[PDB]
Amino acid sequence: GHMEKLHEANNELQKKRAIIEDLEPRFNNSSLKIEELQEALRKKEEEMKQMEERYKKYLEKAKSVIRTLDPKQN
Amino acid sequence: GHMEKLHEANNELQKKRAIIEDLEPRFNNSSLKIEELQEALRKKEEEMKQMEERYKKYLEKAKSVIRTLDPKQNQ
């Protein structure tokens, strides 16, 4: 047949059309997601570096409170 | 005539085939990516939980000291 091969071809085109319309919004969503997961990851890793700044500075501060309050040197 | 319609259709098929063949591995990679990231991020919110627990620890030693040396508690 010839008429019958046009039918098989047009239907497969409708099939691929449906495959594409379903997968595209999915792939777009998942792209957005990867971006926000990395802004969260970056923003968290920054918080962690600050958190280490503070505890570090705290320990150094208490190092000098010890000197100030020690009688054996003051 | 009919020749041309079956040629236009078969070549549109190869177009859509190319679209799909290119997007599908991309979408698979990105599904794996989302879950690798979400893992890294929860291993990181954990590391943070430990570090805030450690800093809150130290911040309550510190006010313990601010209270004992409070002039008002020494009179």
Numbering used by the authors:
A (entry chain A): 550 to 623
B (entry chain B): 550 to 624
Original authors' sentences:
Hook microtubule tethering protein 3 (Hook3), a cargo adaptor protein that serves as a crucial scaffold protein linking cargo to microtubule motors, plays a pivotal role in regulating bidirectional early endosome trafficking, managing directional movement, and maintaining Golgi morphology. Among these domains, the Hook domain together with the first and second coiled coils serve as the dynein-binding region, whereas the third coiled coil-containing the carboxyl-terminal region interacts with several proteins, including fused toes homolog (FTS), FTS−Hook−FHIP1B (FHF) complex subunit Hook interacting protein 1B (FHIP1B), and kinesin family member 1 C (KIF1C).
The crystal structures of Hook3(553–624) in an apo form and in a complex with KIF1C(714–809) were determined to resolutions of 2.7 Å and 3.0 Å, respectively.
